[PDB]
Write a protein that binds this ligand. Structure first.
Ligand SMILES: [Ca+2]
Ligand SMILES: [Ca+2]
Lengths: 123, 123
């Protein structure tokens, strides 16, 4: 779910509030996403969107009435490392992995303030 | 909470259902507990009971209306290792630690079937 992803990002980037800093950035970071990523952070978001689209195709994911942003899973942050738990059932484990890769992606690319609240007509 | 503790035990002892195997064992494993522990597993339970009693004394724990068995926290099981998450606020982190020490204790001591559903008059 959205609250775990928020925690995963804070695990890698302790100085940020992800829901404020990364929401509505470029063409992909945020609800939906279309067009060409405007930069590397936006591209992290695009990969994350694709990952969630893949999860939806899974037989296991389609058995639970739960949106990826509400489907809770278990993970831990220890010494700024993210660990998805083995207690996670197949769907939740796929989602946890998507979220983990994105948090790490986010922390490795440049943040361009010019792309915050990007005019969706650039997409 | 009780469901995380159940998962922590299964993390260290994958062959068991903790709620069935360890509930009502000796004088301490289970709701309450008095008397002298009948063995080492029962003593793990006693330490766990004391840990939960300590948690209750904490200023931070006393601010939340939540029983230790309902107060959810975050942890992960990876390659049979338990890791309490840094996302845990003070109370939850104390409780997570109590639970982790007990799961590990459980997995290191003998299990005596004679003490299952011990007649509470031995306590
Ligand atoms: Ca998106
Ligand atoms: Ca007890």
């Amino acid at each position: 779910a959205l609250w775990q992803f928020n925690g995963m990002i804070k695990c890698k980037i302790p100085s940020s509030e992800p829901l404020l800093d990364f929401n509505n950035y470029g063409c992909y970071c945020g609800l939906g996403g279309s067009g060409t990523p405007v930069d590397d952070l936006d591209r992290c978001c695009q990969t994350h969107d694709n990952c969630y689209k893949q999860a939806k195709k899974l037989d296991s994911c389609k058995v639970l009435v739960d949106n990826p942003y509400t489907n809770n899973y278990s993970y831990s942050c220890s010494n700024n490392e993210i660990t998805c738990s083995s207690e996670n059932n197949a769907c939740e484990a796929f989602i946890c992995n998507c979220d983990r890769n994105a948090a790490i992606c986010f922390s490795k690319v440049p943040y361009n303030k010019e792309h915050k609240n990007l005019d969706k007509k650039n997409c």
